[PDB]
Design a protein around this ligand. Sequence first.
Ligand SMILES: N[C@H]1CC[C@@H](Nc2cc(Br)cc3cc(C(=O)O)oc23)CC1
Length: 271
Amino acid sequence: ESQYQVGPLLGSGGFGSVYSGIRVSDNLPVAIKHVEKDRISDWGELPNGTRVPMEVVLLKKVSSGFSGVIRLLDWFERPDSFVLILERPEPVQDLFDFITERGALQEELARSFFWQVLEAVRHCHNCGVLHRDIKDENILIDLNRGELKLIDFGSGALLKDTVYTDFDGTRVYSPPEWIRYHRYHGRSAAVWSLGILLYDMVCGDIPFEHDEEIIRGQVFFRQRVSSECQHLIRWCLALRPSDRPTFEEIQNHPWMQDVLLPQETAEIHLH
Ligand SMILES: N[C@H]1CC[C@@H](Nc2cc(Br)cc3cc(C(=O)O)oc23)CC1
């Protein structure tokens, strides 16, 4: 309020409305995210019983210097909303916009980005948090450093080992067991969404637009993609959840070897 100067609206949607801002005391770039109270489905509580959006609990759980996940810096409660103060890299572009501009990504570039999204998702899971909405719109690229950041935990849940029977993330990234049965386990649903995301990077758009396509699980490549990259995508998109790879198996897959460092990725591909 007196602590932040507000700049342009960066976007709005099912997550609420996000503005660019600056922390007045030190000029730190921030993002200022507004979530309407009557739009929040899950609430948690802090160690002290303040009731808050679950999004705030999940953000505090993943909060750290590890730069692959967005950092929550502060939050405020207002009569009808919460306001979240988040990190803002500068210059930044989300991966959906990057793919709009560049089209299908060279595999070396997809490999570096996909590897970093894997390290980020693993960090979420180590911290007890299941994101449930991994997709290009929820990934920011720090263009100077070549570092990716997972954002928007507003569809997320505490990670558990039993079945989830609710879901409010993005349907075209959701797995066939959710479409058919309204049931999924967190990790294998996450790896399916990562299959979708990797196809999106290397082909320039997602493979499935319809329920019928998700449930059939047949994958057609409309761009030239190496056999190793196609094998990994088709493995992540296995119809049976226990036939999907673990994160360890994805990162040990032959297509993932020799990944660029984030700085090298910015030097070779982003400038
Ligand atoms: N897909 C778009 C990305 C740019 C903008 N959101 C956006 C920009 C910036 Br910088 C940081 C964050 C953190 C979060 C969040 O946790 O939801 O959203 C953010 C609008 C929506």
